[PDB]
Design a protein around this ligand. Structure first.
Ligand code: HPA
Ligand code: HPA
Ligand code: HPA
Ligand code: HPA
Ligand SMILES: [Mg+2]
Ligand SMILES: [Mg+2]
Ligand SMILES: [Mg+2]
Ligand SMILES: [Mg+2]
Ligand SMILES: [Mg+2]
Ligand SMILES: [Mg+2]
Lengths: 228, 228, 233, 234
């Protein structure tokens, strides 16, 4: 069964659990030198994010098999997740492909914005925009992080107009915050502590996207890069 | 100096030249089984594309040094180029960074559409976030291929309204076609023969983006996947 | 600063100025469904202890630490086969990139490479004897040598090996080790660069084997009782 | 030709009985040194890039595929000829393991064992016509399928002598994988069963291939120039 109850995560496998005291000190891995003074610790290293995404791709391929689907990348934060996912889905599909096979997925991009500093503004700005080509298609939303769940509730509501066949959700990180509205993903990488994360395409006011590991930003970082 | 004469390629290094008789048997490399019947030959393998992009990253870092710039990815065709470019630019910058360094680039996305089948429709569809956030910034346009030169000439005209400080162009492929209007990039990967190429994010009607190598689509493929 | 203390280690077994490894707790790890595991191995594994990507990221940092120590001084890397293969090739890849990225026209190559096959394990236990396939190491006379070893467990392999090296009149002997196990049987031999401290359980993957099996497993995992039984020598 | 009609595992070492042709690299093929990343200090000693790193890796993935299609699920033992085959061998293992383990099911088995032998014969850019051999006891290869993994066939002397040495061990089959074969008029006709590239008769360095222990860390296969041969002369 292809998931089609967005926010319910009806048949989702557990994520990897990153415990409240888990993580690694900054001297454990390569950290760009200028970023070190703004980070408290490494939560999830680049290579483990990548290994987990490979398995997610495998889970997605096991669900869709050869049914055409359309993957929708929420820019900008989902870039890292999306690129690793495309790499691993492609290799898994194409390694098992035979002469009578066909392409597994199409790729689409929507820019959505809602954060300022370390907080949801509670509003969602969307830029795409003709998603009518998605009518009657299976779509897989690819999102970097579910926090409040507000982005995904609002975007899923917004997708209703295009008369898409199914909407499934894949999300790299879910944060254990009391602010969460209950929105669950269908494929989920990691459950993480309630702290604002940066790295692997996740930014704090556009900073730290290029940081390879998922890290916690410290108060000096939040202060230095605050919105002005 | 930082380039600022879009289409002139005033100080550009030569690309790698791929001669008209260059390329490789489809049995030389891994090719997804179902695509083989639709391809003539491999032109540039994945790995050499990646090795060329690393050097282009290096070239870009040598020009900009530590001067902040903003990279504009032209979707969807530029995804593969842009992701490898980001990977290598980040490693090169962050490897040489020191505690007093800062981030080198910001990232932006513009969806730009003009082709149908193997030819330009001669019009250009543009969708992105509001580009006035680029005012007074150094901008680097990242494009997959210059063919007719129409996309870039029109897109650069359009950027004239935003009061950007400089506009430089990085292009992965330039096609030696008599249809070319003369638009030159500032950083260029490969010069290629006059044939419609697919793979490495370049499509024919949304097909073959997931193909890892740059290949020539054959007449059977053009017919099978024709717009209808 | 380098004028006050020469950074290249020269007290093998002492780990005189070693950074601490990443500490992996006994209850740390992941179930087998969290990552890619070859389907036929799953029945023989308890859990993933350290994922492949963590190991690779750690090794990049070790490369960095090694480059900071040796700077521009030529040294010779000595790979203890077969188990050190994964560690060693990751280490070379990263050392070469870090060195070659910062190199200038007047720079020079940083390291030579060398291989020795040494063997001591049967099943999950050291036999207490080290077999060395002798190879002509006199090319190491008066050179800085860095031994690259997958895992320190009892420490017997490395004490016996450093003893064998004495005859070659090497200039310095430093040790890099991917894993050190917190076994009560450890003789106290410490590495100069160490990746991870792990609990006292028999691990496989990332080139580490149980009787030649599991070297191709990408993640460091614990072999279970059924695996130990199935692949018993 | 189906597997019940002809057994695919090669067993006529030196004959390359059913080998796919290699990628052919022409004498005038290649790239300027500013085309790719080259360690700044090597550039004065190199003439051009002949085969870029990424091309080699992609080729090796296809060799892994070809090898997996041949052996299918039968256990074989890979024998890495040190030091020069390191690059080839580690890329080959990475891809072979992924191809095998991606298609593996619950009842599958491991595909290969790995073994190492140090062999040596070159001084400067020429074969010395003698071969030094160092390894573990290879009697563990008795009755096994073995695949020798070799960086480069040039005169073919290393491999004729090595295969002759192997005879004492009563191995079941001996197949050869080789990354480069050089079109040298000195070639004794020893052919590999799986071969990556055919290259012109010039001394190459990079991708683990050395000139007197130098250039192994160079990522791309390049030609060493005369200054390089002079500077790093034995
Ligand atoms: O913790 C976060 N970090 C970065 N972006 C986010 N968006 C929601 N939560 C986060
Ligand atoms: O050759 C091409 N292939 C794919 N897209 C293109 N856009 C311009 N030329 C091409
Ligand atoms: O735990 C281990 N696993 C594999 N090889 C080893 N050699 C010493 N300890 C170990
Ligand atoms: O051209 C070569 N380069 C390096 N090693 C070699 N061994 C035989 N030929 C060569
Ligand atoms: Mg967001
Ligand atoms: Mg954000
Ligand atoms: Mg276009
Ligand atoms: Mg297109
Ligand atoms: Mg062992
Ligand atoms: Mg040699």
């Amino acid at each position: 069964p292809i998931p089609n109850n967005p926010g319910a995560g009806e048949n989702a496998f557990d994520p990897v659990f990153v415990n409240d005291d888990d993580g690694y000190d900054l001297d454990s891995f390569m950290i760009p030198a200028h970023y070190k003074k703004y980070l408290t610790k490494v939560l999830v290293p680049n290579g483990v994010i990548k290994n987990r995404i490979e398995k997610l791709a495998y889970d997605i391929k096991k669900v869709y098999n050869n049914e055409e689907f359309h993957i929708l990348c929420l820019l900008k934060g989902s870039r890292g997740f999306f690129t690793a996912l495309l790499k691993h889905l492609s290799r898994i599909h194409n390694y098992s492909a035979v002469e009578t096979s066909k392409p597994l997925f199409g790729e689409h991009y929507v820019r959505v914005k809602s954060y300022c500093n370390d907080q949801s503004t509670g509003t969602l700005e969307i830029v795409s925009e003709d998603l009518s080509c998605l009518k009657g298609k299976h779509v897989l939303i690819v999102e970097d992080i579910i926090d409040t769940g507000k982005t995904l509730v609002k975007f899923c509501e917004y997708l209703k107009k295009f008369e898409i066949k199914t909407v499934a959700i894949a999300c790299l990180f879910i944060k254990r915050t009391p602010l969460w509205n209950g929105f669950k993903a269908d494929f989920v990488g990691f459950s993480i502590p309630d702290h604002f994360v940066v790295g692997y395409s996740l930014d704090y006011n556009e900073i730290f996207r290029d940081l390879d590991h998922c890290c916690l930003v410290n108060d000096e970082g939040k202060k230095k890069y605050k919105a002005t």
